[PDB]
């Protein structure tokens, strides 16, 4: 019922590795309509990271099997329907998050830090939705991902230090979206090099900067 009560549930759930619970708590905190603290916002994001991450992982697995059973048609059909089950949960979860972002988190964001963080989340979960979308639906959804990432990118260029982990985090994913969703290794690389370039100036974060480098070696090699 109460916000402090729900925040504590969420932490307890996290300790228990029960993330459905963790997410639902933090859903209810969001739906109370006030702007989340940094603590609360990281709870939310961790919770759905895990909730969504488990399906993305499972999907990958069953999708590998669907492919590797071409020729064995009944087996492939079994894998395909099961993938479809996973995709339904994956859509429920994306729509949940995206809806919280539309109704609560993005409207209430009063600071640059949080508006960027939440627009990135939106980029992220539109990306996730897109990855299991069909046909024309896919195309529009990929666009909504581009836009949320771009907007966050523009706000972050203007309002945040180049070393800020939310701003480097944005650059990682946005560049990974350029590679993985739009097949632009030239746009991916440029973006990632530019963020690394501008962070390195004001060091006088490392993990994300390292991750940028890592991804860079993969794309070109």
């Amino acid at each position: 019922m109460d916000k402090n009560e729900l925040v504590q549930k969420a932490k307890l759930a996290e300790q228990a590795e029960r993330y459905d619970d963790m997410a639902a708590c933090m859903k209810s905190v969001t739906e109370q309509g006030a702007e989340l603290s940094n603590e609360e916002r990281n709870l939310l994001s961790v919770a759905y990271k895990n909730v969504v991450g488990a399906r993305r992982s499972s999907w990958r697995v069953v999708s590998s099997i669907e492919q590797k059973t071409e020729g064995a048609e009944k087996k492939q059909q079994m894998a395909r329907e099961y993938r479809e089950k996973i995709e339904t949960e994956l859509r429920d979860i994306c729509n949940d998050v995206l809806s919280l972002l539309e109704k609560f988190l993005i409207p209430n964001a009063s600071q640059a830090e949080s508006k960027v963080f939440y627009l990135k989340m939106k980029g992220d979960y539109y990306r996730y939705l897109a990855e299991v979308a069909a046909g024309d639906d896919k195309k529009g959804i990929v666009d909504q991902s581009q836009q949320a990432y771009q907007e966050a990118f523009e706000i972050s260029k203007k309002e945040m230090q180049p070393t800020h982990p939310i701003r480097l985090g944005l650059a990682l994913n946005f560049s990974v979206f350029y590679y993985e969703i739009l097949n632009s290794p030239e746009k991916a690389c440029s973006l990632a090099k530019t963020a690394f370039d501008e962070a390195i100036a004001e060091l006088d974060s490392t993990l994300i900067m390292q991750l940028l480098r890592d991804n860079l070696t993969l794309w070109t090699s």
């Binding site: 990271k49 895990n50 991450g53 992220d124 985090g169 990682l172 994913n173 990974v176 993985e180 994300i208 991750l211 890592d214 991804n215 993969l218």
Partner: peptide
């Protein structure tokens, strides 16, 4: 791949 935390 490689995006942010975990």
């Amino acid at each position: 791949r490689l995006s942010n935390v975990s």
